[PDB]
Amino acid sequence: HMSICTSEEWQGLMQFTLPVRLCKEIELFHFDIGPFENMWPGIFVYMVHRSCGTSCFELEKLCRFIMSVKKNYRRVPYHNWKHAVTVAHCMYAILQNNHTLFTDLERKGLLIACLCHDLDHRGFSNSYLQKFDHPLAALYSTSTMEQHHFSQTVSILQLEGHNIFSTLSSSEYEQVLEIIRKAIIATDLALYFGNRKQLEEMYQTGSLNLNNQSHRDRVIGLMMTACDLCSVTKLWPVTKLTANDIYAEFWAEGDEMKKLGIQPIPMMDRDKKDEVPQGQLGFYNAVAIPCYTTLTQILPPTEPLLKACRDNLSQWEKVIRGE
Amino acid sequence: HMSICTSEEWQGLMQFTLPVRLCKEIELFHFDIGPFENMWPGIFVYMVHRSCGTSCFELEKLCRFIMSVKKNYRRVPYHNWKHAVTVAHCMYAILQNNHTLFTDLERKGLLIACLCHDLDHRGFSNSYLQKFDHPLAALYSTSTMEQHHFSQTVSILQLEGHNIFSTLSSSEYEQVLEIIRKAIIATDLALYFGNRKQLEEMYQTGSLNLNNQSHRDRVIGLMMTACDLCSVTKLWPVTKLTANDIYAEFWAEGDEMKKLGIQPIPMMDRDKKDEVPQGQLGFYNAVAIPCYTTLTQILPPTEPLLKACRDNLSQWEKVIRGE
Ligand SMILES: COc1ccc(-n2c(CCN3C(=O)c4cccc(OC(C)C)c4C3=O)nc3ccccc3c2=O)cc1
Ligand SMILES: CC(C)(CO)n1c(=O)[nH]c2c3cccnc3n(-c3ccccc3)c(=O)c21
Ligand SMILES: [Mg+2]
Ligand SMILES: [Mg+2]
Numbered sequence: 001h002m003s004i005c006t007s008e009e010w011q012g013l014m015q016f017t018l019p020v021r022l023c024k025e026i027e028l029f030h031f032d033i034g035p036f037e038n039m040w041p042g043i044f045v046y047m048v049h050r051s052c053g054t055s056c057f058e059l060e061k062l063c064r065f066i067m068s069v070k071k072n073y074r075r076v077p078y079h080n081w082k083h084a085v086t087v088a089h090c091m092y093a094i095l096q097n098n099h100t101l102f103t104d105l106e107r108k109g110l111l112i113a114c115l116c117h118d119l120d121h122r123g124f125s126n127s128y129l130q131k132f133d134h135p136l137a138a139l140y141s142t143s144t145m146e147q148h149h150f151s152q153t154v155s156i157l158q159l160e161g162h163n164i165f166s167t168l169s170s171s172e173y174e175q176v177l178e179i180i181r182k183a184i185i186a187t188d189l190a191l192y193f194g195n196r197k198q199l200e201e202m203y204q205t206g207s208l209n210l211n212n213q214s215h216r217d218r219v220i221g222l223m224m225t226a227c228d229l230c231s232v233t234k235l236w237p238v239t240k241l242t243a244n245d246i247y248a249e250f251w252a253e254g255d256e257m258k259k260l261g262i263q264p265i266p267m268m269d270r271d272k273k274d275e276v277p278q279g280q281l282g283f284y285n286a287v288a289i290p291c292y293t294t295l296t297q298i299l300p301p302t303e304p305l306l307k308a309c310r311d312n313l314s315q316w317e318k319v320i321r322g323e
Numbered sequence: 324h325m326s327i328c329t330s331e332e333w334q335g336l337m338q339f340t341l342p343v344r345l346c347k348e349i350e351l352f353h354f355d356i357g358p359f360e361n362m363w364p365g366i367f368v369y370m371v372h373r374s375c376g377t378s379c380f381e382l383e384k385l386c387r388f389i390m391s392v393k394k395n396y397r398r399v400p401y402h403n404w405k406h407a408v409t410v411a412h413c414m415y416a417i418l419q420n421n422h423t424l425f426t427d428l429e430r431k432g433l434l435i436a437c438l439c440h441d442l443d444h445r446g447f448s449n450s451y452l453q454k455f456d457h458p459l460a461a462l463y464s465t466s467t468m469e470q471h472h473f474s475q476t477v478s479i480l481q482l483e484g485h486n487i488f489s490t491l492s493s494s495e496y497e498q499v500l501e502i503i504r505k506a507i508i509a510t511d512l513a514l515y516f517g518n519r520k521q522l523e524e525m526y527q528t529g530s531l532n533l534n535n536q537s538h539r540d541r542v543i544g545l546m547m548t549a550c551d552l553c554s555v556t557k558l559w560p561v562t563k564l565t566a567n568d569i570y571a572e573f574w575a576e577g578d579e580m581k582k583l584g585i586q587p588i589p590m591m592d593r594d595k596k597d598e599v600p601q602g603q604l605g606f607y608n609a610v611a612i613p614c615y616t617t618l619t620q621i622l623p624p625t626e627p628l629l630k631a632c633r634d635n636l637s638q639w640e641k642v643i644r645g646e
């Protein structure tokens with residue numbers, strides 16, 4: 001039922017070497033992958049090698065995993081392969097700047113989870129699938145898509161010559177699958193508010209214990225959300241272009257409702273496209289700024305993220321005011 | 324300007340007596356008015372008299388109102404005089420089964436609002452009038468048609484010997500015009516989704532209180548939508564025939580767009596008649612079933628509506644399956 005890669009695809013990836021100029025840039029939080037589409041699979045390999053090591057995964061098995069993952073990402077406007085590598089890059093930048101804060105079993109799982117977190121996205125919300133009783137909503141009652149993304153990840157790893165986590169003991173293997181499970185479920189934005197709530201109180205009262213697994217998993221969750229929203233941390237022209245992509249996806253979902261006689265929420269309605277600048281300001285103020293603020297409080301090296309978020313908020317604020 | 328009834332028309336109505344056989348059928352929710360065309364105006368009078376008494380309105384003024392309302396309903400395939408009386412009948416059945424929950428003034432207003440809710444329908448959607456900048460969209464920015472229906476109701480009552488509420492105190496009169504205003508605006512399906520969602524929430528958290536005017540207006544609104552969609556609660560052959568009438572009206576609207584070059588949505592496209600069973604399944608699942616479900620939860624005697632809705636959904640389910 002999955003979509004395996006061709007021999008051609010993984011072999012070419014194995015041959016790819018990252019140009020020396022982009023070595024500097026890939027270390028920066030505001031790095032846009034956008035202009036280098038042919039390099040995106042190659043960029044993930046680099047990040048995996050630069051973080052955990054050149055001998056952490058079997059190069060053959062790794063290249064087959066990446067290229068098969070790419071094939072299970074649909075041609076949707078925003079929740080595509082480009083997003084999966086943008087999110088992973090941000091995770092790489094965070095994991096680099098907090099090098100001794102996470103175990104090599106967390107480091108491996110976190111990058112793989114970021115590349116897989118939106119696997120098989122059909123450009124529809126959890127609310128859409130529940131409202132139209134889609135077979136996926138029948139399998140997973142809550143965090144519908146996120147539970148499906150995790151199921152597709154597990155299915156890719158279950159393919160011949162794809163299990164990149166096969167060299168781990170049964171204990172070490174079930175441990176990493178759980179890191180990935182939790183990281184992907186955490187990408188369900190509805191769960192985020194509560195997570196950034198509990199993390200805010202835990203930071204204030206100094207109760208956040210990094211040795212406590214339950215507490216550990218909450219930080220990883222926020223790290224996932226911060227990576228998932230990193231489009232608001234890029235330079236203004238990049239940020240502006242990405243906004244157009246997620247709207248195009250939202251509008252297409254609304255169009256599907258309009259066809260059935262249903263009225264979409266303003267966000268999903270393309271006839272309320274002028275409401276987008278105000279909607280962005282609302283999202284940045286209610287979702288993005290709180291996220292990066294708390295992330296910086298827990299992991300201070302992640303400060304540039306919050307800085308770039310603020311810069312873009314100001315840009316949206318200028319758009320509203322008519323520059 | 325309006326369309327006044329003839330002396331002949333209202334005089335004959337005053338003389339009409341309902342057949343003793345029908346007395347029991349009119350009390351049932353699944354009652355089809357379709358076979359009794361000559362009796363439709365007479366049926367409304369009966370319902371008025373059995374709901375609010377025989378001395379609630381001046382028989383002369385009432386018969387003139389009904390017959391002139393009938394004349395301001397166009398010969399469109401679905402949004403016609405037959406629809407008005409079907410909607411009103413369903414409202415009568417709901418009022419009857421929950422008699423003491425409502426005031427004599429709401430019973431008066433809701434039945435009149437149901438007979439008037441589609442007054443002067445031209446067989447076009449609000450989406451159409453707005454996209455093609457029709458003069459009616461210039462007057463009313465939102466709920467375009469519904470605001471026009473309320474304006475035509477007020478215009479009929481403003482006719483000589485037509486003011487059926489003239490015998491109410493200035494306070495009662497302005498309260499009944501507001502009951503009607505709100506009930507007709509509520510027939511704009513776009514507003515329904517928010518209304519259903521809010522009411523479901525209020526029921527779940529037990530915060531719903533019929534003594535709270537704001538809550539009361541939300542229930543009346545849902546009652547209006549349930550009545551507006553009662554065609555899906557009739558027996559299968561009736562339900563099937565009505566679907567043909569709304570589609571004849573939608574197809575005519577699509578034809579108007581095709582003439583200007585614009586491509587209608589599948590629902591409004593007559594070359595796309597095969598997608599109709601799936602369109603119905605989507606409408607029943609996303610609109611009709613949620614509606615009756617919530618209505619039954621607020622007013623449990625209205626359960627037959629949800630029962631018959633389910634029976635028709637199963638019928639559409641069978642059509643898709645090739646049964
Ligand atoms: C809970 O707080 C809010 C605040 C604002 C919104 N909102 C938005 C943001 C949409 N949106 C996401 O709901 C999202 C989720 C995840 C990522 C994302 O943007 C990515 C590119 C980072 C986005 C995004 O733009 N745009 C609108 C556009 C027109 C009219 C209304 C709105 C509106 O109410 C929604 C939720
Ligand atoms: C209920 C009916 C007529 C059943 O045949 N129906 C249908 O099949 N599709 C639809 C339908 C589909 C799309 C939008 N409105 C619809 N309405 C509608 C129209 C105007 C005001 C309120 C609701 C229906 O009555 C209906
Ligand atoms: Mg997601
Ligand atoms: Mg209407």
Ligand SMILES: [Zn+2]
Nearest residue numbers: 083117118228
């Ligand atoms: Zn994502």
Ligand SMILES: [Zn+2]
Nearest residue numbers: 440441510551
């Ligand atoms: Zn109607």
